[PDB]
Amino acid sequence: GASGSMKRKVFYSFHFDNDVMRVQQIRNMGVLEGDEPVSPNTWEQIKRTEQGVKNWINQSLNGKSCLVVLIGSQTANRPWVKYEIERAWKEGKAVVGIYIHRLKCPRNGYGTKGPNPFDQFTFKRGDRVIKPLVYEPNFNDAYSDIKNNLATWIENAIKQ
């Protein structure tokens, strides 16, 4: 029989102006099925109102079992990243973080390691306190380390 592929659909949460090209490398690995971004002009239209942004986030997260935060230098302070993490967690979805400063951006090279966005918050499910999982790729050749382990990392978050 012809072999098939089955990839988990995910929502990527990240700081665009610093990390969009690093996240592209993860898309290129072909391991997860993340939604592609809307165009810049479409994003500007969405951003005209807070309700529009929330509608877009809520709709994009709806059919996703896992939110994947790609952690760069400023991700922890992005207000819509906070909203996305909160929405995914409140909706019972998996939440996981991956540091991406060791992915080499064609423009900015290697990045500054940023704070863990999740550490600013206390997460609970059913009165248990949980810390979302965060993975730190190998300092040298982070691309290959991520590619080899990303699918498992997301399944670990799903089972949490």
Ligand SMILES: NC(=O)c1ccc[n+]([C@@H]2O[C@H](COP(=O)([O-])OP(=O)(O)OC[C@H]3O[C@@H](n4cnc5c(N)ncnc54)[C@H](O)[C@@H]3O)[C@@H](O)[C@H]2O)c1
């Ligand atoms: N186009 C998109 O899909 C898009 C863009 C930005 C943010 N977001 C959502 O908001 C969250 C927070 O991100 P943020 O804090 O960077 O938001 P933000 O609203 O602060 O980002 C605005 C910036 O996004 C850039 N941008 C928009 N569309 C882009 C694209 N297609 N490719 C490259 N750059 C693009 C613009 O340069 C702009 O400066 C993200 O996790 C994501 O869910 C989505």
